[PDB]
Design an enzyme around this catalytic site. Structure first.
Site, mmCIF file in Angstrom:
data_model
loop_
_atom_site.group_PDB
_atom_site.id
_atom_site.type_symbol
_atom_site.label_atom_id
_atom_site.label_comp_id
_atom_site.label_asym_id
_atom_site.label_seq_id
_atom_site.Cartn_x
_atom_site.Cartn_y
_atom_site.Cartn_z
ATOM 1 N N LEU A 83 0.805 -1.172 0.000
ATOM 2 C CA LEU A 83 0.000 0.000 0.000
ATOM 3 C C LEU A 83 0.833 1.213 0.000
ATOM 4 O O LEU A 83 1.878 1.224 0.548
ATOM 5 C CB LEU A 83 -0.887 0.021 1.189
ATOM 6 C CG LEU A 83 -0.153 0.417 2.429
ATOM 7 C CD1 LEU A 83 -1.161 0.935 3.413
ATOM 8 C CD2 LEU A 83 0.483 -0.836 2.958
ATOM 9 N N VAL A 84 0.307 2.266 -0.587
ATOM 10 C CA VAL A 84 1.037 3.513 -0.773
ATOM 11 C C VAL A 84 0.137 4.677 -0.384
ATOM 12 O O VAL A 84 -1.042 4.713 -0.751
ATOM 13 C CB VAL A 84 1.537 3.648 -2.223
ATOM 14 C CG1 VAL A 84 1.704 5.104 -2.609
ATOM 15 C CG2 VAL A 84 2.840 2.902 -2.377
ATOM 16 N N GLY A 92 4.950 6.975 -9.270
ATOM 17 C CA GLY A 92 5.903 5.921 -9.558
ATOM 18 C C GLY A 92 6.371 5.139 -8.347
ATOM 19 O O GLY A 92 7.164 4.197 -8.503
ATOM 20 N N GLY A 94 4.691 3.163 -6.043
ATOM 21 C CA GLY A 94 4.207 1.790 -6.085
ATOM 22 C C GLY A 94 4.995 0.905 -7.031
ATOM 23 O O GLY A 94 5.326 -0.235 -6.696
ATOM 24 N N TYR A 125 -0.422 -4.843 -11.769
ATOM 25 C CA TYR A 125 0.547 -5.911 -11.570
ATOM 26 C C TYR A 125 0.891 -6.633 -12.847
ATOM 27 O O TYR A 125 2.010 -7.141 -12.965
ATOM 28 C CB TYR A 125 0.038 -6.942 -10.568
ATOM 29 C CG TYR A 125 -0.026 -6.403 -9.193
ATOM 30 C CD1 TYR A 125 1.126 -6.248 -8.440
ATOM 31 C CD2 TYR A 125 -1.232 -6.009 -8.658
ATOM 32 C CE1 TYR A 125 1.070 -5.733 -7.175
ATOM 33 C CE2 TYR A 125 -1.307 -5.494 -7.415
ATOM 34 C CZ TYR A 125 -0.150 -5.356 -6.662
ATOM 35 O OH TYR A 125 -0.227 -4.837 -5.393
#
Ligand SMILES: CC(=O)SCCNC(=O)CCNC(=O)[C@H](O)C(C)(C)COP(=O)(O)OP(=O)(O)OC[C@H]1O[C@@H](n2cnc3c(N)ncnc32)[C@H](O)[C@@H]1OP(=O)(O)O
Ligand SMILES: CC(=O)SCCNC(=O)CCNC(=O)[C@H](O)C(C)(C)COP(=O)(O)OP(=O)(O)OC[C@H]1O[C@@H](n2cnc3c(N)ncnc32)[C@H](O)[C@@H]1OP(=O)(O)O
Ligand SMILES: NCCc1c[nH]c2ccc(O)cc12
Ligand SMILES: NCCc1c[nH]c2ccc(O)cc12
Lengths: 146, 146
Positions: A83-84, A92, A94, A125
């Site tokens: 998580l960010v 950028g 993540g 992903y």
């Protein structure tokens, strides 16, 4: 095993694969993202029993991103809770966190790097190289309640 | 924690969650199923770093079944490498072994039990209560070499 990613002016971003993640800092982050609080002792038990916990900190330290994996130290790993912080998304971070995560596990000779992705971030992903249901392999949950 | 499942003649099947599985006995079983040899040191490292390992023995001891699981000791487990000897398949032993695995994990208070199912045995886990891709969540691999 610590790095400085970028520097901006008016702070830096520091990736680490050490693990010094204070469960109160992490809690704070999960809140920003709207996750529901979980017993901090149980959060502390999950970080302790996670083969890899990776961090981005925003010094001027400040938790702004995390990912962690379980693993059997040998063949498989599974990536959870990447998580960010909202006010750092779209920069950028993540991507960089994930890249280094994968790289760390390759360097420790984990050959099978897996994860479970919400429908809304599966594309994030696949871009990173992840491949869904390869050869008809399915990812299954025992009586999930989502 | 150690249980006697059934009794036959012409032998009793024994379930253990204890962990003492001989890597030589295990390798023997993986050949019986056609799996490829793997560094015994690494096999041995993957058992010691598996939150739960559960065994099926045929005493008269002979390893006839196994399943293991990693976990963060708090929230998630992932079940890998569940396999039973071809000489003993079709008898309920895969099913028995799985049920107790799940019960052991619920006992330990793991709420999220997950696995990755090959195509030919996805049905086998649905009957046990596992649901694939629940509401969009996809299991994903990084550049799978399959
Ligand atoms: C592991 C699991 O079980 S699910 C994972 C759990 N993670 C979360 O739910 C955290 C919630 N989401 C977030 O906090 C973040 O928005 C993240 C991690 C999903 C994305 O992080 P960000 O830092 O915003 O992404 P980042 O800056 O690395 O962007 C990377 C790239 O992916 C693209 N991208 C960004 N967000 C998304 C998204 N939500 N979906 C698809 N693609 C995305 C970007 O456009 C960018 O593309 P490009 O660099 O090729 O031009
Ligand atoms: C964990 C992963 O990564 S994916 C799975 C990994 N494991 C493997 O690939 C090893 C291969 N598995 C096997 O050889 C075993 O046969 C197993 C594990 C599939 C099942 O073991 P068995 O003991 O033969 O199954 P068991 O005898 O318990 O049968 C249980 C039930 O499942 C059914 N079943 C057996 N094999 C299958 C199958 N391939 N698909 C669907 N159902 C099956 C049986 O008919 C039985 O049904 P019933 O009792 O309702 O009549
Ligand atoms: N693995 C399903 C996604 C998921 C995993 N852990 C979670 C925790 C909270 C949440 O809202 C969602 C999740
Ligand atoms: N379902 C068996 C697929 C499979 C083939 N080879 C394997 C090796 C390891 C493993 O976990 C799984 C496999």
């Amino acid at each position: 095993e610590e790095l400085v990613l970028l520097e901006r002016t008016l702070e830096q971003i520091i990736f680490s694969s050490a693990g010094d993640v204070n469960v109160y800092d992490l809690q704070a982050l999960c809140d920003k993202v709207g996750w529901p609080r979980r017993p901090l002792t149980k959060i502390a038990a999950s970080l302790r029993n996670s083969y890899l916990v990776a961090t981005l900190h925003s010094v001027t330290k400040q938790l702004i991103g995390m990912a962690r994996a379980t693993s059997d130290h040998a063949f498989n790993a599974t990536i959870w809770d990447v998580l960010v912080d909202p006010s750092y998304q779209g920069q950028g971070l993540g991507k960089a966190l994930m890249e280094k995560v994968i790289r760390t596990l390759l360097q420790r000779d984990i050959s099978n790097i897996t994860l479970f992705a919400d429908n809304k971030v599966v594309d994030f992903y696949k871009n990173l190289g992840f491949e869904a249901d390869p050869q008809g392999i399915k990812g299954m949950f025992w009586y999930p309640r989502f």
